[PDB]
């Protein structure tokens, strides 16, 4: 096989709310594992001991190419944590480039609230930069090792489809899928132009939000609030997460636009699902949300706009098939904005590490209706964009 982009199209699967994973093989002979794709962290780690929620796990003793680094590691996330033993082994991506890399691998020996009951993944691929790797930035992340040992160009792109994913009639109702194109950009995954925002600093995929509109109405906050203490693009986060103050203004504005003031507060807090009769979800009463991002030239921005189909997430197995139920998937953060699957499922997202920038284009698979579509538009003249970034005061 050639490792061409067409072979990589559709190489992700997932269950809604449980991340997206790619198949990988580790060790010699290869052991196949499904690996969550996480642009919000920088460690490659795999279940390496039994766990009630693991269908399979990595067995270092079965691999003649395993090398023990004789160092432990602990990694905490916003939700979940694990610890394990560092080592290196040969790693491949069967529907990725046609190459084999010696990479650092954390062999997970204990964990808490990390693995998800029934999820079909057994490990995590942290795609961000060494600065946020544990135990420290000397543990070269997977994508760095891939680029350094092979000729793969230093970029990847993600198309997360959500419920826009072609399924058989007989597949489980919450299955989602998508593509990770490693080494470039595949033109079948998007429509219109790609628009780029600078990667502000290489640690997380940090970006700068310069304006927010709901229903085309400016939220009118000081733009520093949008990026307090950072804004990141994160495939391993489900929601659009917003700083408290921004969250509260967002909910107020969404309620006002849609006349849902009387919806219970538990709904807005993600503690209750809203249910309508199947087929009758009134999408049109809910507003579009736009984030304007810093552009590539002086005083220039562009915006990405998502629909209620992105921020009201369908939940299966909670009511009769006669009803469609949704979770409000915009939530509060005390660690900055996270553009999770709620944002990424509208767009093809290019993590152009070589040029220190993130591209967005309308996704060919985003969920929308006959009246509205997700959008990426620009250019706009915007002043004082550099002032939008947070700095330690």
């Amino acid at each position: 096989r050639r490792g061409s982009f067409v072979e990589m199209v559709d190489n992700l699967r997932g269950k809604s709310g449980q991340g997206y994973y790619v198949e990988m093989t580790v060790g010699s002979p290869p052991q196949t594992l499904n690996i969550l794709v996480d642009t919000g962290s920088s460690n490659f780690a795999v279940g390496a001991a039994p766990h009630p929620f693991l269908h399979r796990y990595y067995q270092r003793q079965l691999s003649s190419t395993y090398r023990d680094l004789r160092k432990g590691v602990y990694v905490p996330y916003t939700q979940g944590k694990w610890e394990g033993e560092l080592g290196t082994d040969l790693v491949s991506i069967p529907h990725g480039p046609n190459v084999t890399v010696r990479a650092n691998i954390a062999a997970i020996t204990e964990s808490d609230k990390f693995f998800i009951n029934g999820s079909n993944w057994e490990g995590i691929l942290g795609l961000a930069y060494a600065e946020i790797a544990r135990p420290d930035d000397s543990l070269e992340p997977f994508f760095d090792s891939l680029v350094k040992q092979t000729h793969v160009p230093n970029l990847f792109s993600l198309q997360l489809c959500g419920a826009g994913f072609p399924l058989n009639q007989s597949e489980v109702l919450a299955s989602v899928g998508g593509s990770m194109i490693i080494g470039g950009i595949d033109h079948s995954l998007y429509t219109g132009s790609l628009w780029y925002t600078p990667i502000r600093r290489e640690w997380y995929y940090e970006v700068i939000i310069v304006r927010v509109e709901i229903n085309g109405q400016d939220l009118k906050m000081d733009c520093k609030e949008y990026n307090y203490d950072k804004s990141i693009v994160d495939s391993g986060t489900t929601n659009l997460r917003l700083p408290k103050k921004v969250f509260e203004a967002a909910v107020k504005s969404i309620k006002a636009a849609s006349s849902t003031e009387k919806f219970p507060d538990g709904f807005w807090l993600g503690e209750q699902l809203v249910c309508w009769q199947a087929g009758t979800t009134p999408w049109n009463i809910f507003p579009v949300i736009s984030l304007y991002l810093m552009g590539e030239v002086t005083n220039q921005s562009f915006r990405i706009t998502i629909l209620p189909q992105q921020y009201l997430r369908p939940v299966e197995d909670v009511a009769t098939s006669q009803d469609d139920c949704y979770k409000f998937a915009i939530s509060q953060s005390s660690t900055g904005t996270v553009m999770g699957a709620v944002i990424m499922e509208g767009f093809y997202v290019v993590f152009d590490r070589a040029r220190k920038r993130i591209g967005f284009a309308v996704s060919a698979c985003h969920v929308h209706d006959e009246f509205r579509t997700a959008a990426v538009e620009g250019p706009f003249v915007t002043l004082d964009m550099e002032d939008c970034g947070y700095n330690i005061p």
């Binding site: 996480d38 996330y77 994160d234 538990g266 939940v315 979770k327 996270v338």
Partner: peptide
């Protein structure tokens, strides 16, 4: 006595991937 939309408990069902530093 019944009606749409209605609200039921639930939620969670999320991933939230690394803590800073």
């Amino acid at each position: 006595g019944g009606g749409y939309p209605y609200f039921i408990p639930x939620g969670x069902g999320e991933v939230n991937x690394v803590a800073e530093x």
